[PDB]
From a paper:
To make the CDH enzyme accept bulkier substrates, we envisioned the variants of the hydrophobic pocket which consists of residues W113, L530 and F352. To our delight, the W113A variant allowed the CDH enzyme to accept bulker substrates and improve the enzyme activity in comparison to WT CDH. The resulting W113A variant had overall improved enzyme activity and substrate scope, i.e., accepting the bulkier carbonyl compound, dihydrocoumarin. Structural analysis of the W113A variant revealed a broader, more open active site, which helped explain the modified substrate specificity. A DCPIP colour change assay was used initially to assess any differences in activity of WT CDH and W113A and Y195F variants on cyclohexanone and the eight other test substrates. Activity was observed for (i) WT CDH and the W113A variant with cyclohexanone, 3-methylcyclohexanone and 4,4-dimethylcyclohexanone, and (ii) the W113A variant, but not WT CDH, with dihydrocoumarin. To study how the W113A variant made the CDH enzyme more promiscuous, we performed MD simulations of the W113A variant in complex with native substrate cyclohexanone, 3-methylcyclohexanone and 4,4-dimethylcyclohexanone. The MD simulations revealed that the W113A variant contains additional space in the active site to accommodate the methyl groups in the 3- and 4-substituted cyclohexanones and the fused aromatic ring of dihydrocoumarin.
Additionally, the final product is often contaminated with side products due to over oxidation and therefore requires considerable purification efforts. This manuscript focuses on a cyclohexanone dehydrogenase (CDH), EC number 1.3.99.14, an enzyme which can perform α,β-desaturation of carbonyl compounds with exquisite selectivity. CDHs belongs to the succinate dehydrogenase/fumarate reductase flavoprotein superfamily and use flavin adenine dinucleotide (FAD) as a cofactor to perform the dehydrogenation of cyclic ketones. The natural substrate for CDHs is cyclohexanone, a simple cyclic ketone. The SelenoMet WT CDH crystal structure was solved using single wavelength anomalous diffraction (SAD), using the selenium atom as the dispersion centre. The crystal structure of WT CDH is organised into two domains: a catalytic domain (Cd) which is situated at the ‘top’ of the enzyme when viewed in the orientation shown in Fig. 3A and an FAD binding domain (Fd) which is situated at the ‘bottom’.
Residue numbers in the entry:
A (entry chain BBB): 64 to 598
B (entry chain AAA): 63 to 598
Amino acid sequence: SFSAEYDIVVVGSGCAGLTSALFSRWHGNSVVVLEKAAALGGTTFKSAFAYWVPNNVPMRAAGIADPKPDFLKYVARVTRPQFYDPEHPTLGLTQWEYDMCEAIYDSASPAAELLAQKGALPYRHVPFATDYFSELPEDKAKSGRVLTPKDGSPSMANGGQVAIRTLSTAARRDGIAFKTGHRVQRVILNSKGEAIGIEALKDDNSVVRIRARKAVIFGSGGFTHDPELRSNFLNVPVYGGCAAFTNEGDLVRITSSLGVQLRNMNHAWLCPVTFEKAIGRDGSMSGMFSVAGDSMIFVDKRGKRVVNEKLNYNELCQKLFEWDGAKVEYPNLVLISIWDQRSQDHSASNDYGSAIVPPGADDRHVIKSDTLDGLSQQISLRLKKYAGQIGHMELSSDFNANLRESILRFNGFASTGKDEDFHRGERASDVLFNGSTKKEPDQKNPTMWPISSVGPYYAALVGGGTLDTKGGPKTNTHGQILDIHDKPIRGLYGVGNCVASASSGAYWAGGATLGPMIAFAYRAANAAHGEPKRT
Amino acid sequence: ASFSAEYDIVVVGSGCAGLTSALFSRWHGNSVVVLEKAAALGGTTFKSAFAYWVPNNVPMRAAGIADPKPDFLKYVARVTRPQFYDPEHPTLGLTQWEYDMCEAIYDSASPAAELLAQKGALPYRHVPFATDYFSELPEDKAKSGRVLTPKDGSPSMANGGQVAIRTLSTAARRDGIAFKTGHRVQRVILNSKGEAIGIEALKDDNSVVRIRARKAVIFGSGGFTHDPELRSNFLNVPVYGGCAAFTNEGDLVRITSSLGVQLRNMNHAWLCPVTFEKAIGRDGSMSGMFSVAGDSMIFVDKRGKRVVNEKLNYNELCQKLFEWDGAKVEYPNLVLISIWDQRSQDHSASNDYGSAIVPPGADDRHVIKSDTLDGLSQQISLRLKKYAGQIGHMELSSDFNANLRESILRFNGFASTGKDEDFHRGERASDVLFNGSTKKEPDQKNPTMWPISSVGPYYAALVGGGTLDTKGGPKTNTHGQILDIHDKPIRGLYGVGNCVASASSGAYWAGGATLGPMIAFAYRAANAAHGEPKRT
Ligand SMILES: *Cc1cc2c(cc1C)nc1c(=O)[nH]c(=O)nc-1n2C[C@H](O)[C@H](O)[C@H](O)COP(=O)(O)OP(=O)(O)OC[C@H]1O[C@@H](n2cnc3c(N)ncnc32)[C@H](O)[C@@H]1O
Ligand SMILES: Cc1cc2nc3c(=O)[nH]c(=O)nc-3n(C[C@H](O)[C@H](O)[C@H](O)COP(=O)(O)OP(=O)(O)OC[C@H]3O[C@@H](n4cnc5c(N)ncnc54)[C@H](O)[C@@H]3O)c2cc1C
């Protein structure tokens, strides 16, 4: 038996849990939110809280249609490229993927509107944020879908903190109970196999059992920080990610005897990371969404550019895991970001995972030297320090010569404004996350400027990480966790990164994690409200 | 509820894992049944060459070829976990589990092979020339010698699997192992203490049968290549299928979903290029493309440019096909086009090892043909159109013809000097080793290349990425015992072969690197299962 009882028990206090809790409470249920950490907010707290809301009221107010068939074609084209077909009944998606994407379109705006109306998540529009693949002809609403917390800073970097504040303030105002230091570790079933509550491990190592009359809703985030799970499931061998450190995939263990379908386990939301911060478990670390610097290139261990440094983070991270079967190594396992004094002075940022950081910031990851040859010596020392993580990678014997050639070639591209090798700056999204730069009259392309012929020169190692994972128990479009016959496990719900995303390995646009997540919190809460009170 | 039959040991699947597990079990004196889902025995194993890679095997020792254990471990460690391999680390940078599993392979494969041969179940011959796939690594101290093959396999060895299933199943029958075909196991039955006490299987006629196991249920049920949902949701690359038996649909993943197991290595398969049209068309006789045929032959992408060494090890080459172009939201190499001339048609064709170049009389529906290169590109275009819904509506670039001419001029230079400046074709031993048949040419500096003909006819085939089978599933210890989430055996429950987690990660060490380890674990599993008390 149990020491407490509520209509709805919510696990986790990021976006998925707080919104699920609020929607549940507003239907009149009693609700508790159980949080494993000492503080609320999880990864959501660290985010910019961009949220991508199709057919939102700001768009409609501007007379911008977001036609539903074209919304589905955009997400289908990006999510399942090989199979996308406009003439196919579900656009080449499976029925489940199609229905999930449809649910996002149907429910995101009503969810966003209700949260705002109740003062839980007031927003402003981000009209100029373009979708990450807006150039595709399938995208018929290329900008307009993004919302952000109303009181977020101009950079929006603190959006997640603002959102956790407004969400949790409304939750307290409306009588939702909170318990921190409660690590849920078990779902309790009745004799009919229905979820009737949880067991949680407390700080002092005692367990408590808490009954849920109607539903247990998991919003417990991903598994980035269980290295075993991460390594065994993800399609790339990432070194970590900006996910909260308490996101260790507990739901995967919780459901291991429940007969669930683990889906999309092979995918994470990907991003490059400041490699030394991932290895060193810096909890304040962000994914490198904006690769800082215009007088800045990435080179491999041969001293050559291999990629557009301004490419969308979810795609750029994948470059780091290209495999060289002939040499039995990952040639790009870490890349080296190299920049000059101009970028140091005018492109530094504490936000969006920039490796270029302003005076006073933690600079332990920054490598520095007065010559290019000196820099390579310093980079070598850094590679040696982390040898056991990166295959004992070394700079090639012709590194310095190749680097000089790479800088000369790039400097040409920066003069003409045309990167003939990797097309840096030619897609809108490259400009979108370009970061701060020193204004230069008659810079031809804002993403490039010639690297100075004098030092000092700076560098940082860039490795591959996650925002968090996006695989877990499969749900229906109402957030109900399914058994292997696709039938709900009665009373059991999941929302957010702890369950399977329908987005496969794709990242549609800024806010493509939180926008869908709010839609499903709303659908989950609406369904959970309809549950009979049991046991 | 009750059971309609009872045995000491119940074995699920009749490929290598199941037959060997069953035989070892029976020879300890247990009663044994083998439950096979299909109408026929043998699974993927039946289709294989039955190369099996057996470290420190008796033929090697008899020939005076050393295979020191510490160096064996460094070879497999270096290949398996490249980022973390470290000769100074106590487990070489592997996890304790991976290290222990690799050690078990070295310790147990040879005694397993010896016993199966002694009993006449798997007589073998040595294949002294079969060389490891990364033989150039200094860690490999026994670069050749580890491979065995069924004694009566053909000279090419291509029917080895059929011979092995014949000798194994004949011995099994001889020694009183029971067989039930058309029995699709779908559930493990537990007692009140949560121990495995038997199975439920679905029969062809849709009746269900419950069969008690006194000591152990051993799964040898193969991988999940042919469950598209599981394949698509777990593997690190979006493969189109594979040469796995079509009945390999990952049943064990569903069976164990309520048993609290740890699914491990789910992100990896044994990978290989495939003749794309045979994967899409579900040709059950299809083999992975283990040798890419032809010396006067190149692979081009849809731009008409070479992108890869066509002679690269199959498990590595397959990965090239899934390179991702984030800027264009496409897989640039999703299919590559193998193009060859009459010389390669005549002298490199093969019915074996997944060759796209096939001799007269072989099924050649996948072969595209034209008298001119310009005609060939028109023919290739029609083929891409036919499969548009599978390959992102990929098209040849508008400058395909001109690029191809340039690619062939470049390659023809490389073929005459013997030096492929772009992709180093022929510079690693395995490129030469798996090069396939070629017309002997006195003037040839590099056996893997010869100039492409200045006249037609020309031939082409689409190449896509596939599997041999998957290699993730419930984690076992080195004794084949399926573990719960606290790393403790689920009593009575065993798994061997592709249905459980391989310790090889995404790596393919050598020819026979699936079957060799597999026999080691069948032996260890059977030895442990024999030790189980009789229960329920
Ligand atoms: C495709 C292929 C693979 C291959 C090869 C050549 C080809 C064309 N050559 C190889 C080689 O020479 N050496 C080597 O090491 N590997 C080679 N491979 C890979 C290899 O064939 C496989 O790794 C290996 O044979 C797998 O053996 P295993 O015993 O694990 O699996 P199987 O042979 O596929 O048999 C599984 C059987 O189980 C039955 N099954 C499936 N589900 C059920 C249920 N529910 N109940 C009962 N039986 C079930 C399948 O029907 C199958 O028969
Ligand atoms: C720096 C950064 C910036 C980002 N910016 C954006 C952005 O602007 N827009 C966007 O769409 N996405 C963004 N993302 C991704 C986004 O933050 C996440 O996808 C989203 O916040 C996940 O929310 P969630 O509720 O699923 O999980 P989380 O916010 O991670 O919350 C899960 C919570 O569950 C708790 N928990 C875990 N296990 C248990 C247990 N056993 N019992 C109890 N509680 C448990 C955790 O401690 C945690 O508090 C960003 C990510 C990062 C790292």
